[PDB]
Amino acid sequence: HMRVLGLNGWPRDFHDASAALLVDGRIAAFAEEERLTRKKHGYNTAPVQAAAFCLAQAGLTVDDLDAVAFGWDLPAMYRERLGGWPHSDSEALDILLPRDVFPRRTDPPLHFVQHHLAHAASAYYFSGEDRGAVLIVDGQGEEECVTLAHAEGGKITVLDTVPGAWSLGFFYEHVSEYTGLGGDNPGKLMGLAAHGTTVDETLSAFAFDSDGYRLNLIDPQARDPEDWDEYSVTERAWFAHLERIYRLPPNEFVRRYDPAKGRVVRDTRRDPYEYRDLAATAQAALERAVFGLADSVLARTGERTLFVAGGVGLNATMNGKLLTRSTVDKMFVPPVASDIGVSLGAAAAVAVELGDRIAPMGDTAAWGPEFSPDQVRAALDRTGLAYREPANLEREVAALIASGKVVGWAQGRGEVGPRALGQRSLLGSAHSPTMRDHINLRVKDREWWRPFAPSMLRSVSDQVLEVDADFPYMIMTTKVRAAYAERLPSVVHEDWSTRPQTVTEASNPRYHRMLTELGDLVGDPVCLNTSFNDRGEPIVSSPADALLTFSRLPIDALAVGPYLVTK
Ligand SMILES: Nc1ncnc2c1ncn2[C@@H]1O[C@H](COP(=O)(O)CP(=O)(O)OP(=O)(O)O)[C@@H](O)[C@H]1O
Ligand SMILES: [Fe+2]
Ligand SMILES: [K+]
Numbered sequence: 001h002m003r004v005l006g007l008n009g010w011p012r013d014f015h016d017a018s019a020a021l022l023v024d025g026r027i028a029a030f031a032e033e034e035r036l037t038r039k040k041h042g043y044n045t046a047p048v049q050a051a052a053f054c055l056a057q058a059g060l061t062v063d064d065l066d067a068v069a070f071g072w073d074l075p076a077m078y079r080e081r082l083g084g085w086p087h088s089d090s091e092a093l094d095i096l097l098p099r100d101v102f103p104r105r106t107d108p109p110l111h112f113v114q115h116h117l118a119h120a121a122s123a124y125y126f127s128g129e130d131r132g133a134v135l136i137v138d139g140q141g142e143e144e145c146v147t148l149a150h151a152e153g154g155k156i157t158v159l160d161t162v163p164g165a166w167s168l169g170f171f172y173e174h175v176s177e178y179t180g181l182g183g184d185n186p187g188k189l190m191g192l193a194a195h196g197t198t199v200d201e202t203l204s205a206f207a208f209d210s211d212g213y214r215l216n217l218i219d220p221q222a223r224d225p226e227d228w229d230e231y232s233v234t235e236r237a238w239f240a241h242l243e244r245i246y247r248l249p250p251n252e253f254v255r256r257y258d259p260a261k262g263r264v265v266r267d268t269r270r271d272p273y274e275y276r277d278l279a280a281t282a283q284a285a286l287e288r289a290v291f292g293l294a295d296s297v298l299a300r301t302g303e304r305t306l307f308v309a310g311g312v313g314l315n316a317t318m319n320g321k322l323l324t325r326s327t328v329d330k331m332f333v334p335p336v337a338s339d340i341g342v343s344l345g346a347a348a349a350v351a352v353e354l355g356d357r358i359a360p361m362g363d364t365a366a367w368g369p370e371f372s373p374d375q376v377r378a379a380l381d382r383t384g385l386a387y388r389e390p391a392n393l394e395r396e397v398a399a400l401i402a403s404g405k406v407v408g409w410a411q412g413r414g415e416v417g418p419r420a421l422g423q424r425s426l427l428g429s430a431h432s433p434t435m436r437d438h439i440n441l442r443v444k445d446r447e448w449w450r451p452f453a454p455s456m457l458r459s460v461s462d463q464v465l466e467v468d469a470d471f472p473y474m475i476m477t478t479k480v481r482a483a484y485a486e487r488l489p490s491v492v493h494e495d496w497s498t499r500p501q502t503v504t505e506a507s508n509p510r511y512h513r514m515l516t517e518l519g520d521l522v523g524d525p526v527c528l529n530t531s532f533n534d535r536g537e538p539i540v541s542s543p544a545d546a547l548l549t550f551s552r553l554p555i556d557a558l559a560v561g562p563y564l565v566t567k
């Protein structure tokens with residue numbers, strides 16, 4: 001067996017720590033550090049817990065690993081930006097896999113994989129497609145913010161890159177920060193976009209062309225000599241430019257004691273909704289930039305299949321429009337397009353180099369921890385809450401959803417990536433015209449303007465959506481067909497876009513059975529599926545996590561394993 005543990009996350013100036021374990025090209029385990037630590041974004045840490053989970057899941061120790069793979073070229077970033085790489089491989093392993101958690105007789109070979117190659121690998125090798133164009137659109141790797149590559153015969157060959165200061169990723173985050181939504185919540189900005197109107201998608205900054213874009217505002221070779229990414233350099237240029245061309249100045253953060261909460265809370269001086277027009281304009285600019293990049297790499301490669309990874313690959317709206325583009329026939333974007341995925345991608349690149357063949361992900365992201373009925377019962381018994389073990393959990397849950405109740409659903413292996421896909425989900429009626437406001441304002445405490453997304457059977461997705469394809473990851477938006485746009489109001493956005501999950505019997509029989517039961521009740525086997533967590537909070541992972549969230553929120557029921565808890 002070829003066993004490769006892929007890692008991301010490092011104690012110095014890092015985010016999105018994660019670990020993935022490949023055994024013979026298959027994902028044996030994969031987790032995000034934040035889910036286990038409950039510390040959002042997995043900042044400034046080696047993926048200690050995620051890696052410990054991965055080994056436990058597969059029943060391995062480090063001595064059973066053929067290789068450890070890291071999803072950045074770290075030595076190169078230390079040599080370039082920090083005056084030298086001071087670690088032997090052994091010292092580096094001691095940092096990535098601390099010996100108090102990871103005892104080992106000897107050191108496995110350590111591989112550093114160039115960051116965008118790792119991003120690329122996470123898309124290509126898991127797509128189930130033999131070849132295609134590669135588009136990596138990121139905040140920043142070691143130097144570059146964009147990579148165009150050709151995937152074929154199991155090789156990834158880089159065609160061109162874009163330097164970091166021209167980052168579309170940073171641009172989008174800077175706008176997000178500017179609006180008061182936050183640089184770490186660009187998904188919020190994407191949601192805001194449809195509520196606004198675009199006048200000038202250049203933002204007096206971008207020039208667009210057939211192959212991508214230009215940013216003559218920023219010197220493309222600009223480097224921050226005091227950090228190792230160009231975030232703060234781009235932040236300055238973008239903030240100054242935006243305050244000049246846009247009617248509103250930056251939204252400022254307000255920190256004040258709230259006597260109702262007994263804490264200093266952080267808020268914004270203005271409502272971010274006021275910036276909706278800027279959001280719409282930023283979204284249009286990104287889309288236009290990315291359309292050019294994608295057309296360019298597809299034409300240069302002679303391919304009609306497009307792979308996308310990198311943080312910007314989380315832009316589901318953009319992904320949905322790429323899909324409908326005349327230059328695109330098939331498209332694969334992995335659930336872990338962002339940096340959490342470079343652990344998996346580093347592991348794949350190394351596994352391939354070692355002669356392994358990589359299995360396609362196959363319509364599931366479900367690779368984190370799961371818990372046995374006995375483990376769930378211990379967590380239940382700890383809280384002292386009453387509960388049942390229904391003879392037909394799926395039918396009962398469907399009935400709860402049909403009646404307008406909000407049901408926690410914590411089953412099987414935790415999903416990896418930022419979307420809940422029926423392993424750690426909160427379920428609601430897709431047909432309710434009040435469900436959206438209820439979950440936003442009462443349950444999860446989000447902005448009224450945030451949209452929700454549906455899970456549905458692959459079998460009906462042709463009738464519901466304007467595209468007939470698998471949408472396993474909620475990473476692409478698409479238009480709802482006419483009859484359903486008014487039938488499914490809690491899960492349609494301002495522009496009749498939705499961000500669907502299609503469910504097959506194979507990928508998740510339990511969820512599939514549930515939706516089938518739901519379709520018998522409300523006509524359509526579709527439900528609202530938002531992630532199981534308070535807004536802002538990491539998706540719940542453990543049964544204790546699920547119970548804490550269940551009890552802090554006005555959720556009606558929780559189906560956790562085979563058990564049903566009712567408020
Ligand atoms: N059809 C659609 N069109 C545009 N945006 C959509 C959409 N469907 C969902 N979204 C948005 O995608 C964004 C998700 O980004 P995230 O940063 O992951 C916030 P979240 O994690 O979904 O919220 P949560 O913490 O309350 O669970 C949200 O703004 C969500 O509203
Ligand atoms: Fe990245
Ligand atoms: K098409």
Ligand SMILES: [Mn+2]
Nearest residue numbers: 418420530531
């Ligand atoms: Mn969520």
